[PDB]
């Protein structure tokens, strides 16, 4: 048994892991490079699609099945397995990737054919191929996220996807996983842990309090996966000690993807499922908006607050935020809340630098406003996290990080006595 890394080697986008066991060959997700990498979803997968038997995807995130249409465009036509909640929020994002990417690498009949190969694989339902024996394990990072254990030639392997961060409240907590030859593992921030969920929570509420009480503006840049909606869901469960405002979840696709939560619920912590059960639902707080097209996007930007905005890029790097933040920067009454990572180098490091003006949309913009970064929202597990869950097993590789930060949890690792490597771009590792 080996496993081929065909992305996220040294780098957080591009998952796309070829497990060659019995004559067999599995694709452990196939996502698109993202950011600086984009041109790279229209260079070759490294492996023919043609000779791939099946395929299984361990969540929804573009970075984790944005390349499913290229790999049926190049031919492939096998079977694709994931959770229901993975397959439903899949539509979503693969239609959304399809309208609004720069230089498309693929077209409608690719995402249609794509979406017609998916089939239902539930959290412990056993996948027979050849020789080999696969199943789903809770990863807790998103609705329907799994990591994949792969059982074959007496040998057993454990890709863990993306981890999810068990200090929060919507996502059931990840599973250990089994003991196991090998685990292909994320090292997302395997240089540090995350500051606390709770006060990181009670934080967040103080900066909503303060910044509605005196009238301004909270602008929260968030992804419309999983972020905004558990933003959201914080508003349900604690905004009764907040000022009365509206709260603009101005994300089209964030709205598409909050009315699929209803259908959702089983994927959801036990807390968030006994909300549910009481008739409901916790994901829409009191005054709740989403906004559909730009016009009335553009109005936010000169009305005044009080309010709460969320809207993307999650990272800046284009979006309806961009013109909040062109237009709210400059009043010091107004608070920019990061609640999720910026990369180095792009515009949230940049403002979170705290320079005196910064350039959006052209011109510079003076940086009055408030600004927040509360790392404890982190949906992947953090160092700390990472550790306990690799506990006991004997060889690790690791993929999904920054070079600097997988060397830091490799460096604990083999302080503890486990063997541990960084994934190498199309170079086999034995199970
Ligand atoms: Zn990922
Ligand atoms: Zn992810």
């Keep these: 048994m080996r496993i081929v890394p065909f992305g996220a080697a040294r780098e957080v986008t591009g998952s796309a892991?070829?497990?060659?066991?019995?004559?067999?060959?599995?694709?452990?997700?196939?996502?698109?490079?993202?950011?600086?990498?984009?041109?790279?979803?229209?260079?070759?997968?490294?492996?023919?699609?043609?000779?791939?038997?099946?395929?299984?995807?361990?969540?929804?995130?573009?970075?984790?099945?944005?390349?499913?249409?290229?790999?049926?465009?190049?031919?492939?036509?096998?079977?694709?397995?994931?959770?229901?909640?993975?397959?439903?929020?899949?539509?979503?994002?693969?239609?959304?990737?399809?309208?609004?990417?720069?230089?498309?690498?693929?077209?409608?009949?690719?995402?249609?054919?794509?979406?017609?190969?998916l089939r239902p694989l539930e959290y412990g339902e056993w996948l027979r191929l050849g020789a080999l024996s696969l199943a789903f394990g809770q990863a807790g990072h998103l609705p329907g996220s799994a990591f994949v254990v792969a059982q074959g030639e007496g040998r057993t392997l454990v890709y863990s996807g993306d981890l999810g961060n068990r200090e929060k409240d919507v996502l059931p907590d990840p599973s250990l996983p089994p003991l196991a030859d090998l685990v292909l593992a994320e090292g997302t921030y395997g240089d540090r842990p995350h500051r606390p969920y709770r006060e990181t929570v009670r934080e967040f509420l103080e900066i909503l309090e303060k910044t509605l009480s005196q009238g301004g503006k909270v602008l929260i840049p968030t992804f419309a996966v999983e972020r905004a909606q558990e933003i959201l869901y914080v508003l349900y469960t604690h905004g009764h000690r907040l000022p009365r405002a509206p709260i603009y979840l101005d994300s089209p696709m964030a709205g598409r993807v909050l009315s699929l939560y209803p259908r959702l619920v089983r994927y959801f912590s036990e807390e968030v499922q006994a909300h549910f059960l009481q008739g409901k639902n916790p994901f829409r707080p009191a005054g709740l908006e989403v906004v559909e097209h730009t016009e009335a996007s553009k109005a936010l930007n000169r009305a005044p607050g009080p309010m709460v905005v969320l809207a993307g890029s999650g990272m800046l790097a284009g979006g309806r935020i961009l013109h909040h933040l062109k237009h709210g920067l400059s009043d010091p009454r107004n608070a920019l809340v990061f609640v999720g990572y910026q990369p180095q180098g792009g515009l949230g490091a940049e403002i979170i630098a705290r320079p005196p003006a910064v350039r959006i949309l052209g011109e510079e913009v003076p940086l009055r406003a408030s600004v927040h970064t509360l790392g404890g929202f982190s949906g992947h597990a953090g160092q700390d996290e990472l550790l306990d869950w690799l506990q006991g097993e004997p060889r690790v590789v690791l993929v999904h990080g920054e070079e600097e930060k997988l060397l830091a949890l490799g460096k604990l690792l083999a302080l503890r006595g486990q063997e541990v490597s960084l994934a190498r771009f199309g170079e086999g590792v034995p199970v």
């Design 17 to 117: 892991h070829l497990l060659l066991a019995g004559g067999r060959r599995v694709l452990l997700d196939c996502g698109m490079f993202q950011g600086k990498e984009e041109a790279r979803n229209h260079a070759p997968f490294g492996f023919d699609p043609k000779e791939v038997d099946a395929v299984l995807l361990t969540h929804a995130h573009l970075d984790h099945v944005g390349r499913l249409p290229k790999l049926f465009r190049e031919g492939y036509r096998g079977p694709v397995y994931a959770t229901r909640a993975t397959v439903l929020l899949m539509e979503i994002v693969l239609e959304d990737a399809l309208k609004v990417m720069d230089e498309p690498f693929f077209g409608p009949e690719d995402v249609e054919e794509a979406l017609g190969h």
